[PDB]
Amino acid sequence: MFRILTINPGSTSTKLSIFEDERMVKMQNFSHSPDELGRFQKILDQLEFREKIARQFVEETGYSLSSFSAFVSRGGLLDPIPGGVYLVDGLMIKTLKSGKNGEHASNLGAIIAHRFSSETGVPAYVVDPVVVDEMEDVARVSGHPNYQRKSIFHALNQKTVAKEVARMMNKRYEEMNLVVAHMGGGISIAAHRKGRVIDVNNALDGDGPFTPERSGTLPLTQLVDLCFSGKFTYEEMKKRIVGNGGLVAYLGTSDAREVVRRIKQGDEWAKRVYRAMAYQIAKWIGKMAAVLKGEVDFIVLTGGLAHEKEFLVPWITKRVSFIAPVLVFPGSNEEKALALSALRVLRGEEKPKNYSEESRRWRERYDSYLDGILR
Amino acid sequence: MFRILTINPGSTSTKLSIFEDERMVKMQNFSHSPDELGRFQKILDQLEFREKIARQFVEETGYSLSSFSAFVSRGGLLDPIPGGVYLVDGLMIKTLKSGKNGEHASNLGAIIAHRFSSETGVPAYVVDPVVVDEMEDVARVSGHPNYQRKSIFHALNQKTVAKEVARMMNKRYEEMNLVVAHMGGGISIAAHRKGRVIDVNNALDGDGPFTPERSGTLPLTQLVDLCFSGKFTYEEMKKRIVGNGGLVAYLGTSDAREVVRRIKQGDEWAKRVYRAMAYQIAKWIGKMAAVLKGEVDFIVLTGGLAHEKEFLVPWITKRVSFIAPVLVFPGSNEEKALALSALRVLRGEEKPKNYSEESRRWRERYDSYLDGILR
Numbered sequence: 034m035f036r037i038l039t040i041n042p043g044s045t046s047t048k049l050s051i052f053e054d055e056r057m058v059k060m061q062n063f064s065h066s067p068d069e070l071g072r073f074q075k076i077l078d079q080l081e082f083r084e085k086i087a088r089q090f091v092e093e094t095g096y097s098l099s100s101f102s103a104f105v106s107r108g109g110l111l112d113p114i115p116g117g118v119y120l121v122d123g124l125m126i127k128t129l130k131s132g133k134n135g136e137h138a139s140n141l142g143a144i145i146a147h148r149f150s151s152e153t154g155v156p157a158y159v160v161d162p163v164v165v166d167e168m169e170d171v172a173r174v175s176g177h178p179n180y181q182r183k184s185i186f187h188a189l190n191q192k193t194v195a196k197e198v199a200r201m202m203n204k205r206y207e208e209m210n211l212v213v214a215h216m217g218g219g220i221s222i223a224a225h226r227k228g229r230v231i232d233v234n235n236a237l238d239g240d241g242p243f244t245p246e247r248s249g250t251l252p253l254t255q256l257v258d259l260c261f262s263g264k265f266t267y268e269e270m271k272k273r274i275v276g277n278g279g280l281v282a283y284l285g286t287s288d289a290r291e292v293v294r295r296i297k298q299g300d301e302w303a304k305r306v307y308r309a310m311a312y313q314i315a316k317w318i319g320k321m322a323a324v325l326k327g328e329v330d331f332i333v334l335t336g337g338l339a340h341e342k343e344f345l346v347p348w349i350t351k352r353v354s355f356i357a358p359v360l361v362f363p364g365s366n367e368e369k370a371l372a373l374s375a376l377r378v379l380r381g382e383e384k385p386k387n388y389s390e391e392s393r394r395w396r397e398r399y400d401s402y403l404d405g406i407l408r
Numbered sequence: 409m410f411r412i413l414t415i416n417p418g419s420t421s422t423k424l425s426i427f428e429d430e431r432m433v434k435m436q437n438f439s440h441s442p443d444e445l446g447r448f449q450k451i452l453d454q455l456e457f458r459e460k461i462a463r464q465f466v467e468e469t470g471y472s473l474s475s476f477s478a479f480v481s482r483g484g485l486l487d488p489i490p491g492g493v494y495l496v497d498g499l500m501i502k503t504l505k506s507g508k509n510g511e512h513a514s515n516l517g518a519i520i521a522h523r524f525s526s527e528t529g530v531p532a533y534v535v536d537p538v539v540v541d542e543m544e545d546v547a548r549v550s551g552h553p554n555y556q557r558k559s560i561f562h563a564l565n566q567k568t569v570a571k572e573v574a575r576m577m578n579k580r581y582e583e584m585n586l587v588v589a590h591m592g593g594g595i596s597i598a599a600h601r602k603g604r605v606i607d608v609n610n611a612l613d614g615d616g617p618f619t620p621e622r623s624g625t626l627p628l629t630q631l632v633d634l635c636f637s638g639k640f641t642y643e644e645m646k647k648r649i650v651g652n653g654g655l656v657a658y659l660g661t662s663d664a665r666e667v668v669r670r671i672k673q674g675d676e677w678a679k680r681v682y683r684a685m686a687y688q689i690a691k692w693i694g695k696m697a698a699v700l701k702g703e704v705d706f707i708v709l710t711g712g713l714a715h716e717k718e719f720l721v722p723w724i725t726k727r728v729s730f731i732a733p734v735l736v737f738p739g740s741n742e743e744k745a746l747a748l749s750a751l752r753v754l755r756g757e758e759k760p761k762n763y764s765e766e767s768r769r770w771r772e773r774y775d776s777y778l779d780g781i782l783r
């Protein structure tokens with residue numbers, strides 16, 4: 034019986050849970066109000082504030098941090114790496130604290146687990162960071178030398194549902210081909226070729242179909258124009274990619290249930306914009322089908338939007354069932370996903386990756402690719 | 409946004425959770441040691457003890473019981489009723505407190521929700537009690553007039569996975585035919601005919617295949633003999649049906665992972681007994697296939713034992729795939745299951761049943777059946 038602690042720091046919340054083997058024994062979401070949050074200049078300044086909530090969470094359990102077998106955290110903005118469960122080390126910490134790859138609340142998670150680790154000797158891990166990158170070189174070329182397509186998406190949910198589909202039919206994730214569509218506030222559509230995400234859109238940076246809250250890919254010219262059109266507000270213009278865009282920008286809401294209600298009342302602009310979102314998701318799924326050369330076992334719809342079975346799901350299904358049957362796996366459980374990955378490691382069913390080495394192996398391969406600087 | 413509280417009292421534990429719509433915000437399992445538990449004569453005496461833990465659980469949340477939209481509890485030993493979400497009323501309470509249908513820790517749940525209800529005005533519900541009974545008359549005949557086959561199983565998990573399978577393929581639970589096998593410490597195999605469990609074994613009372621901890625159906629003669637063979641210990645002989653039987657009685661453990669480890673070491677008695685359990689599950693699935701006249705869309709393996717994909721799952725699959733394809737849906741989430749059922753009701757997507765009336769409609773039909781007393 035292994036007792037595990039999962040750490041999941043988000044932009045506006047902090048989720049923690051305790052697992053005893055595969056059974057969850059405690060979980061609590063600690064939301065943070067804009068007020069309470071704006072009290073910090075840089076994101077790193079929240080470090081002690083959030084650690085305090087975690088120590089407190091275990092504290093009022095009667096258990097001590099040394100009674101745990103592992104501490105597991107959501108990855109963060111680490112350098113590109115293959116999927117898997119990594120041991121938190123010195124290089125990871127240095128990178129996270131220096132925000133060399135950007136600052137994000139999720140970076141605090143690994144740091145927090147590491148300290149819990151230095152005080153108890155218990156192992157700390159991070160699994161499937163948002164920077165998981167397992168794509169093929171051909172997918173990196175963008176059309177212009179000083180631009181690269183990068184793999185930045187909800188890799189944890191992707192990998193997790195893919196393995197769930199396999200396990201459901203007692204097959205191996207490694208022997209299938211899938212098109213998995215994670216449709217939440219962010220939308221990533223990935224091509225899984227034999228356990229490897231060979232191509233996917235850069236969801237986190239706003240590339241792809243538009244979402245309930247993001248605008249997704251936008252017209253090039255019209256952009257470079259409205260770019261320096263005086264309307265320049267590096268911030269304002271920058272929030273139209275991850276904050277103020279998509280359904281919320283057209284209908285004034287990012288709640289699908291609200292939008293479906295309107296469609297049932299005869300709202301035509303609402304239905305036209307919602308239908309356009311499904312239309313885009315379908316197109317991208319088509320892109321990924323072409324990536325797999327048509328060899329697709331299943332198309333999987335997952336994420337919050339997969340719950341909407343009256344319009345969205347049926348619309349997508351009609352357009353893409355010619356590629357492969359459609360399977361719906363609604364939602365996503367980050368806590369359970371992280372704890373199980375740590376259990377597999379503790380049970381010796383999976384080998385822990387070493388971020389340090391693993392990062393070098395990746396950069397070495399990427400650097401050989403990047404050697405296109407030869408004129 | 410509806411805030412819901414789920415109440416789940418078990419034999420040795422108490423699980424509570426708080427949902428804000430479909431998002432879980434707090435959950436905690438309160439295990440109770442034999443010492444702390446044996447401090448009460450009758451099960452009803454734990455009433456105030458467990459209520460105190462629930463009030464405390466919400467207490468340290470900052471929220472007040474009146475800020476909730478609903479209180480949801482696991483059913484209990486109520487009189488037979490169709491599946492669904494019931495409003496807790498006076499008749500239910502009277503029945504639970506009087507243990508007329510038996511005493512069980514799960515009975516405390518509804519009672520606790522009801523009080524929370526009388527203090528705040530908020531609605532209290534119980535969903536899919538273990539006594540859900542939707543079988544056909546033909547399935548009730550046992551072979552002897554003063555004996556009836558009763559439907560007592562983990563109806564919540566059954567109903568829940570069945571609907572999940574449907575939703576997965578965007579079809580309606582009401583338009584399919586399934587054989588669902590819940591394989592945990594208790595094993596129920598049910599025939600789902602168009603959204604109605606028309607037949608299933610009385611898992612809770614020890615009828616069916618043997619389990620990791622229960623003996624299941626036993627030889628009649630050998631039983632009636634060993635019945636009054638002096639070895640009579642109404643208790644001891646009674647615990648060989650739900651406590652001391654099955655794998656634990658043969659191998660000395662009810663942990664499948666432990667048993668699989670032994671099989672990998674060459675243990676032959678272990679492998680022979682484990683294989684016999686799969687063998688039995690398969691036979692019962694065959695019984696249910698005959699109940700559906702072969703019209704089966706899918707065979708679904710769910711519950712803890714569904715996690716064991718090295719032996720159990722593959723053994724069952726080989727024996728029954730001639731009936732219909734096999735789908736594996738491991739585990740079971742009671743908290744999420746209860747909260748979602750209350751959300752659907754609060755959202756008006758499902759109508760709440762009235763235990764009082766619903767119980768009469770059931771007994772009336774049963775009584776017409778029972779009218780076989782006409783010589």
Ligand SMILES: Nc1ncnc2c1ncn2[C@@H]1O[C@H](COP(=O)(O)OP(=O)(O)CP(=O)(O)O)[C@@H](O)[C@H]1O
Nearest residue numbers: 216217218219245287288289290336337338340341
């Ligand atoms: N039952 C339901 N019916 C219809 N829509 C639902 C739903 N539950 C959630 N949604 C919608 O699906 C969308 C996504 O929820 P999800 O939990 O995946 O998003 P997120 O807020 O966590 C952001 P991201 O996906 O980038 O992490 C929501 O924005 C909501 O509009």
Ligand SMILES: Nc1ncnc2c1ncn2[C@@H]1O[C@H](COP(=O)(O)OP(=O)(O)CP(=O)(O)O)[C@@H](O)[C@H]1O
Nearest residue numbers: 591592593594620662663664665711712713715716
């Ligand atoms: N990952 C895993 N691999 C193999 N076996 C597992 C497992 N997780 C659980 N099990 C086994 O499956 C069985 C059932 O767990 P489940 O959670 O359904 O049981 P339960 O204890 O809740 C009793 P009941 O099913 O009657 O409520 C356990 O008895 C255990 O031996």
Ligand code: NA
Nearest residue numbers: 243248249250
């Ligand atoms: Na777009």
Ligand code: NA
Nearest residue numbers: 618623624625
């Ligand atoms: Na038996």
